[PDB]
Amino acid sequence: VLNREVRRTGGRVLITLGDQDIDLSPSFVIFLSTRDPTVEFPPDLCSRVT
């Protein structure tokens, strides 16, 4: 989801969540939050978020 790995096939936009594919609506948006300012994030998570 954070990588925006969408598959557009058969007029359908699919996002693969776990083992299940879901029709992704264009109006979806996600905000990740934390209350700890000192938490360290791994570089892979840092590359996928703003």
């Binding site: 990588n3 925006r4 790995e5 969408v6 598959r7 557009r8 096939t9 776990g18 083992d19 791994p42 570089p43 892979d44 840092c46 590359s47 996928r48």
Partner: protein, 1622 residues
């Protein structure tokens, strides 16, 4: 003719031998007489086995074999029958005598009903035909008994909650195991079987006394034999239920002890305050009452005497009758000393010793009181003393005695204590008593702390026993968790007993915190007991434990003895520590204890002896050298003093025995007067301390003895008969026996030393470097004792560090609280139960392995005076007197002071086992044991005759070994590794002579040819056994030294080392170069994984490997990665048919479980009359376990690798322990080959010397420039026959490769980056890559070939580089080497820097323009966006190069990628795009927060089913973030290296895999039905189809740890450093 007599006797025995039956409760006829039946079967089996040795056995072979079979079948059936019967018995008693269990457990009751129905039908069938033969002929009786055993066991494990509910009734059952509790409950009627369990439930009750009917309990007995008669007997008939009459027995025991004390006091009061004591009346009084009661009465009488004196002195200035109390104690002590000087019955002697100790304390206290002018009974220096007030007017007998110390007051518990050792009452002991009694009065726990061996545990036990309390010691470890501690607390609270937890800081800190609240609530319950407001006629005091309301008896206490000085111990939280009162116990009074013990044992010079022995121990501690196995503490002195007492008694007995045969003037007083007490003490000191000393310390300790004990000499008793028995055993085991200074004399002395250590210590260690004759010493001692004493000796050898501690000691189930025995627990419990007469045999439990505090400290209560193994389920197992705990170790650098002080010591030096002894052993086995399975024996005897002159003292081999120790070797050098390699090579030479005789049946080899062959082969074998693990220059050094010192003829070549020669069977030195022809390789297997170019190193290493392997000797190949170790081993195995190799790839996390899974797949376990045998599934085949990284697996903090210990156990002992049922499994047709890098490499650990002594090591270095030129020169000549016009370029191209490779191997090393390893593997890949780019080409100019060469160099060398300057250097030096070896070419057409090759724009892999490739990649990404992933990508040059590299790797079998770069660089996206370009399905594991190892295993099974069964090409793309555990990487390492996971498919999964592989192989047109062949095909399909792409971020520490964690990732995967965007 006598053999037929033996067969006839066996036939007549079993034609009439009937199993003996006995009526059981009119319910059936059970079988008794097990010992007789088993002994008869065993001795007939022994006779049948022995008659095979006779040369007349053949005529009677068949029948004899038949009988053997029958005997074994018998030995099968009844070996089950008994257990079944035993179990059934108590199970029946449980399902018939209790009607509540039927409603409580209906399903279990009905299951047991069916089981008992079948059991009784079998009983009736046995009753009709009691003959053993017909019982054995019952149809399916074996399977019937096996099924009955399984079913009865299941019912047993089902009855657990019933066991708990019954434990609630009689709380002492809380300290009895489930097996024993079932046996007690089910055998309530047959009370005799209860006897063995009383010592579990009582402090001193070892057995109960029963009337003739066995229906009335008349009294109780101790282990020694002391008996107490109940004042009123307890009738079992009146109270049939077992817990009821057990409670009555306990109450009557307490009341009887109270009444006996009431009588003992009123009789001893006469002895007190009396001027003179008649010895006869005194000794009669001591004999009349129990030792506990006698000491208690003496303490009382002294107490009221002192009270009367102090009350009389209330006037202050009045006369002091305290002197009269002193005088009475003096007179009584004089009588006691006079008694102990003369011989006494042992029980009476121990009573006298206890009386002496107590009255010595009383004398000291009275002297202190008189010295300080004490005249008031309320003064504290009297109140601080422990006082005893007895009030006969008290109505309750249990309350007549009160024990008071300071303000603390206690009631005597009246627990029967039997006869127990009582401590010397030292000032430290007085302080301990005072502090602990103050803690008890405050309802606080006690906490003695200090270094090991100071008396903490003993002091707590002595305090409890002085109060008549049942004291229970627990050897705490990390498995004593919250629930186990809670259950133990419940048991002690309901019983009212004292709990002493030693090593209590070995619990986890969280568990200590959790246990604190149980301790707090129990302490509150004790305080409500103290509350006077509380009345005894009210609700019983109760606290909440484990969410249950548990009654708390006021007599219980909780004590913890610990050592804060040990590092790694858990710190106690403050809230826990405030619940305990702590006392430091650091400096025990050694002199006082020594004096009191010597005075009580009867030594007249006790003062002088103690004043000499204690400073002697100090001088031994300080003057003698420092060794880890040295202890001169309180335990050592205590052992010496007890031994001195024993030696004094045996010397008095010997003196009177000599007097019997010389007159009759036997006066015990005269013997006491003329008795060498100092000589006795010297004898004890020597027998206890001499075996532990190193050679240089023995004269030091003798000089100390002369200094402290002048004129006293110690002489060992000449133990002849034992020495002839050991000599016979040495003769029959090919061992060297010597006497004194002869060869083997030191080892024989060490054997004798171990013998007298076994007679004084139940726990002992033999410590000495690997190869010191230790194992042979104890084994030969065991056999000699078996022959001399008639007692069968059985040894259980455990490698405690080859298994987990849970598998060693056992596990308490977290949920069901069910206990599973460990290996040592199971063995000791089997010995204790004595189902098959284990208690009548000598039982030696030998821990042959490394000692560390984690596992050995669980034996602290076993090795000390407790002799108890304490388990976290509250069970304690007593060590039987016939059991010795032994440790066979090479060092003790990780053992602590407690373990060292808790075990006798025998030190073995390297000088104990001389090299001549080893040579004699080898030559004796050569001359006696034939190698074939006699002409072969004749050949061996002749070879031994030839080799004997070189195997003498200061001979050829000894000098060679001495010189080789000075040489440098890739591993540590040990004597036995070289000697074993040499002996195996000589055995191979004997087999070579035999095979030559086979080739020439007409003219066998003569003696002269044999001599010339054997001498040269001995030189050759010495060379390869002493320098085969070293580099070339060391080999030349050893060879030239041999040339200097040898008389054997040698090659006359001037500058060629002897190591370059073999020995032909005609006894001539022939150069190895004669077996290295210049081969021309067929063009289609150029640089193939199987092709090997013959070289001097290849031919020599292959021959040595053949020699070691054909003997099944385990071996290790060591060398730099890519040195050709695996290649050489496979080449050697190709010359060995009937050998199947199986490759295991070790990582840092490798455990024995990998080997176990490999055995599960490739081998089978089978029952044989001699045990479990693990053998390869394929018959007639020897299986080689090839471990590729044997020295990588993690070394723990105590220097032990578990898998190395396990492999050592398999190699030396021929097997291991199956931990599911704790059974010994013997290996058959399984050998071991390991490969490794030098231990100095990062992540590599040195191998244990005990492992190396069995394992010859061969050093395989990188091929030198000439060898590389020759090998790859042949490859190039083979490959460039594709284009004839390029033939003349074979030599330059190879040269170029070599030069560049060499330069690369110099420019980039592991110091810079952990993955900068370059080996001939790069050269092989270079040749293969050029060859693949040449096959479909009809012609090519030289510039095109140079372009291919440069492109392959860039792919192989530059792609792994991290820094830009390294890549620049590689790029420039490619041009440099290219133009150095290939002049007269156009530079631009061959070295145009954008060197790109592809097969995307053409059928063939040809150079591709960057712009055309860019257009093609854009066109393909256009389709890729709409078909797989709609993520637009910006396309730059590095992306094009990266996708070309990924395509190259995806077009190779087992093509695995290690993409290292910053996150977000597009590694995964590019991998998926290239996989889509190649028709590869992309697989990624869907990691979530709850993703575990089982999920990864299922994903691996899915991907392997798709890749190996469905022939689907899958790119398994996985990131480092996907690795949630190290097991993921352990699975991935094996999958990368071999394309198979040994344990991934098990059970139904394996059957489904077999079905799918069958249906997939039938689709491929192959005829495969066998599971092995189908699995091999599946592995090959996985190899060719699956491509693993590992993605990870650059991290120096992370990458370095990654190399050790998953080695295959750096040698089976192509590494691509994408890094960050430039």
């Amino acid at each position: 003719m006598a053999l037929e007599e033996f067969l006839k006797q066996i036939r007549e025995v079993w034609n009439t031998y009937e199993l003996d039956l006995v009526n059981y409760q009119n319910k059936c006829r059970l079988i008794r007489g097990w010992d007789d039946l088993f002994n008869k079967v065993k001795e007939h089996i022994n006779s049948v086995s022995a008659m095979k040795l006779s040369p007349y056995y053949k005529v009677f072979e068949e029948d004899a074999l038949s009988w053997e079979d029958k005997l074994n079948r018998i030995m099968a059936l009844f070996d089950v029958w008994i257990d079944v019967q035993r179990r059934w018995v108590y199970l029946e008693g449980i399902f018939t005598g209790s009607a509540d269990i039927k409603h409580l457990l209906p399903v279990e009751t009905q299951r047991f009903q069916s089981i008992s129905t079948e059991f009784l039908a079998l009983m009736k069938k046995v009753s009709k035909s009691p003959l053993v033969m017909d019982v054995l002929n019952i149809q399916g009786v074996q399977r019937s008994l096996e099924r009955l055993a399984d079913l009865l066991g299941k019912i047993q494990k089902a009855l657990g909650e019933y066991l708990e509910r019954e434990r609630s009734s009689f709380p002492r059952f809380y300290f009895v195991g489930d097996e024993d509790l079932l046996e007690i409950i089910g055998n309530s009627k047959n009370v005799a079987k209860l006897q063995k369990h009383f010592k579990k439930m009582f402090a001193g009750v070892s057995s109960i006394i029963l009337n003739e009917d066995n229906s009335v309990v008349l009294g109780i007995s101790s282990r020694e034999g002391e008996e107490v008669m109940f004042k009123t007997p307890v009738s079992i008939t009146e109270h049939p239920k077992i817990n009821e009459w057990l409670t009555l027995v306990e109450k009557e025991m307490r009341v009887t002890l109270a009444k006996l004390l009431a009588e003992s006091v009123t009789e001893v009061e006469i002895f007190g305050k009396a001027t003179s004591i008649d010895p006869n009346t005194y000794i009669t009084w001591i004999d009349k009452y129990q030792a506990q009661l006698v000491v208690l009465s003496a303490q009382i009488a002294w107490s009221e005497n002192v009270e009367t004196a102090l009350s009389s002195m209330g006037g202050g200035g009045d006369a002091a009758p305290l002197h009269s109390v002193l005088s009475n104690v003096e007179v009584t002590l004089n009588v006691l000393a006079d008694s102990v000087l003369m011989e006494q019955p042992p029980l009476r002697r121990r009573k006298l010793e206890h009386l002496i100790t107590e009255l010595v304390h009383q004398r000291d206290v009275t002297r202190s009181l008189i010295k300080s002018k004490i005249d008031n009974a309320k003064s504290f220096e009297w109140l601080s003393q422990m006082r005893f007030y007895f009030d006969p007017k008290q109505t309750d007998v249990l309350q007549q005695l009160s024990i008071q110390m300071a303000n603390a007051k206690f009631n005597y518990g009246f627990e029967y204590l039997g006869v127990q050792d009582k401590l010397v009452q030292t000032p430290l002991t007085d302080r301990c008593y005072l502090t602990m009694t103050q803690a008890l009065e405050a309802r606080l726990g006690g906490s003695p702390f200090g270094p090991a061996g100071t008396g903490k545990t003993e002091s707590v036990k002595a305090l409890g026993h002085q109060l008549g309390r049942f004291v229970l010691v627990f050897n705490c470890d990390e498995t004593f968790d919250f629930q186990a501690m809670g259950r133990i607390f419940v048991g002690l609270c309901q019983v009212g007993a004292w709990g002493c937890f030693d090593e209590f800081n070995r619990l986890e800190e969280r568990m200590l915190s959790a246990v604190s609240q149980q301790v707090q609530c129990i302490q509150e319950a004790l305080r409500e007991h103290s509350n006077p407001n509380y009345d005894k006629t009210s609700a019983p005091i109760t606290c909440e434990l484990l969410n249950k309301q548990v009654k708390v008896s006021p007599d219980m206490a909780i004590f913890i003895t610990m050592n804060p000085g040990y590092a790694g111990r858990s710190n106690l939280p403050d809230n826990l520590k405030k619940l305990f009162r702590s006392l430091a116990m650091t400096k025990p009074d050694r002199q006082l204890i020594a004096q009191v013990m010597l005075y009580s044992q009867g030594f007249r010079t006790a003062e002088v002896l103690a004043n000499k022995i204690v400073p002697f121990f100090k001088l031994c501690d300080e003057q003698l050298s420092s060794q880890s196995h040295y202890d001169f503490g309180l335990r050592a002195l205590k052992s010496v003093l007890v031994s001195a007492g024993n030696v004094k008694r045996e010397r008095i007995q010997k003196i009177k025995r000599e007097k019997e045969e010389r007159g009759e003037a036997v006066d015990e007083g005269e013997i006491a007067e003329n008795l060498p007490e100092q000589e006795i003490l010297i004898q004890s000191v020597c027998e206890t301390m001499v075996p532990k000393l190193v050679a240089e310390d023995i004269p030091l300790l003798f000089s100390l003895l002369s200094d402290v004990f002048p004129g006293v000499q110690y002489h060992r008793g000449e133990m002849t008969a034992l020495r002839e028995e050991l000599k016979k055993v040495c003769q029959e085991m090919y061992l060297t026996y010597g006497d004194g200074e002869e060869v083997g004399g030191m080892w024989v002395e060490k054997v004798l030393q171990l013998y007298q250590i076994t007679q004084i210590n139940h726990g002992l260690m033999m410590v000495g470097p690997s190869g010191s004759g230790k194992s042979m010493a104890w084994r030969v001692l065991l056999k000699a004792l078996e022959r001399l004493e008639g007692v069968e000796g059985v040894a259980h050898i455990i490698d405690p560090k080859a298994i987990s501690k849970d598998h060693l000691y056992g596990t308490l189930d977290p949920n069901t609280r069910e206990w599973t025995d460990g290996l040592f627990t199971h063995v000791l419990r089997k010995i204790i139960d004595s189902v098959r007469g284990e208690l009548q045999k000598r039982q030696w439990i030998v821990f042959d392995g490394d000692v560390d505090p984690e596992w050995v400290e669980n034996l602290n209560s076993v090795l000390d005076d407790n002799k108890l193994l304490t388990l976290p389920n509250g069970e304690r197992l007593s060590l039987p007197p016939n059991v010795r705990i032994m440790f066979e170790v090479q060092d003790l650098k990780y053992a602590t002071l407690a373990t060292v002080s808790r075990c006798g010591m025998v030190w073995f030096s390297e000088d104990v086992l001389s090299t001549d002894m080893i040579f004699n052993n080898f030559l004796a086995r050569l001359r006696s044991i034939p190698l074939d399975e006699s002409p072969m024996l004749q050949i061996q005897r002749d070879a031994a005759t030839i080799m004997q002159p070189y195997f003498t003292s200061n001979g050829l081999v000894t000098k060679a070994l001495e010189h080789a120790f000075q040489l440098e070797h890739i591993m540590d050098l040990t004597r036995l590794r070289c000697l074993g390699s040499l002996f195996s090579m000589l055995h191979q030479a004997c087999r070579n002579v035999a095979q030559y005789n086979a080739n020439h049946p007409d003219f066998p080899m003569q003696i002269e040819q044999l001599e010339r062959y054997i001498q040269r082969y001995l030189v050759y074998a010495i060379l390869w056994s002493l320098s085969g693990d070293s580099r070339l220059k060391m080999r030349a050094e050893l060879g030239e030294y041999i040339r200097r010192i040898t008389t054997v003829p040698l090659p006359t070549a001037p500058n060629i080392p002897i190591i370059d020669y073999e020995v032909s069977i005609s006894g001539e030195w022939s150069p190895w170069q004669a077996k290295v022809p210049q081969i021309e390789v067929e063009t289609h297997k150029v640089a193939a994984p199987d092709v090997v170019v013959p070289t001097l190193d290849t031919v020599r290493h292959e021959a040595l490997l053949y020699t070691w392997l054909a003997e099944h000797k385990p071996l290790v190949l060591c060398g730099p990665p890519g040195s050709g170790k695996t290649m050489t081993l496979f080449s050697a195995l190709r010359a060995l048919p009937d050998m199947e190799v199986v490759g295991l790839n070790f990582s840092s996390a490798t455990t024995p479980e990998l080997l176990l899974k490999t055995f599960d797949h490739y081998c089978e376990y089978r029952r044989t009359p001699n045990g479990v045998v693990l053998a390869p599934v394929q018959l007639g085949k020897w299986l080689v376990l090839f471990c590729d990284e044997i020295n990588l697996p993690d070394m723990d903090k105590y220097g032990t690798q578990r898998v190395i210990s396990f492999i050592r156990q398999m190699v030396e002992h021929g097997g291991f322990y199956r931990t599911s049922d704790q059974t010994w499994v013997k290996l058959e047709r399984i050998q071991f080959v390991g490969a490794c890098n030098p231990p100095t490499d990062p992540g590599r650990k040195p191998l244990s010397h005990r492992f190396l002594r069995h394992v010859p090591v061969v050093y395989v270095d990188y091929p030198g420039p000439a060898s590389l030129t020759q090998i790859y020169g042949t490859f190039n000549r083979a490959m460039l026959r594709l284009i004839p016009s390029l033939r003349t370029y074979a030599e330059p191209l190879t040269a170029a490769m070599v030069e560049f490779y060499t330069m690369s191997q110099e420019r980039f090393t592991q110091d810079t980056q952990p993955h900068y390893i370059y080996s001939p593997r790069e050269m092989t890949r270079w040749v293969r890559g050029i060859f693949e780019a040449l096959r479909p080409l009809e012609t090519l100019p030289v510039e095109g070939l140079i372009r291919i060469w440069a492109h392959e160099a860039l792919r192989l060398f530059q792609d792994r580089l991290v820094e830009d300057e390294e890549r620049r250097w590689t790029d420039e030096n490619i041009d440099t080497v290219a133009l150095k070896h290939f002049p007269n070419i156009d530079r631009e057409k061959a070295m145009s820097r954008p060197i790109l090759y592809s097969n995307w724009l053409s059928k063939d892999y040809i150079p591709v323009d960057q712009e055309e490739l860019r257009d093609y990649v854009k066109a393909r990404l256009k389709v890729f966006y709409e078909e797989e992933l709609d993520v637009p990508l910006v396309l730059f040059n590095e992306v094009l190069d990266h996708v070309l590299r990924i395509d190259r790797i995806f077009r190779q079998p087992q093509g695995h990628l290690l993409l290292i770069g910053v996150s977000g660089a597009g590694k995964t996206t590019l991998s998926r795009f290239v996989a889509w370009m190649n028709g590869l399905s992309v697989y990624q594991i869907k990691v979530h927060r709850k993703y575990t190892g089982e999920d990864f295993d299922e994903d691996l099974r899915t991907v392997l089913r798709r890749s190996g069964c469905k022939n689907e090409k899958i790119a398994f793309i996985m990131d480092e973030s996907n690795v949630l555990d190290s097991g993921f990487l352990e699975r991935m390492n094996t999958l990368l290296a071999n394309g198979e996971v040994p344990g991934l498919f098990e059970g139904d999964e394996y059957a489904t895999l077999m079905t799918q592989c069958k249906e997939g192989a039938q689709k491929e047109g192959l005829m495969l039905d066998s599971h092995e062949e189908l699995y091999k095909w599946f592995t090959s399909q996985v190899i060719r189809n699956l491509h693993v792409v590992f993605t990870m971020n650059p991290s120096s520490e992370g990458l370095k740890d990654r190399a050790a964690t998953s080695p295959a990732l750096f040698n089976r995967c192509v590494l691509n450093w994408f890094g960050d965007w430039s």
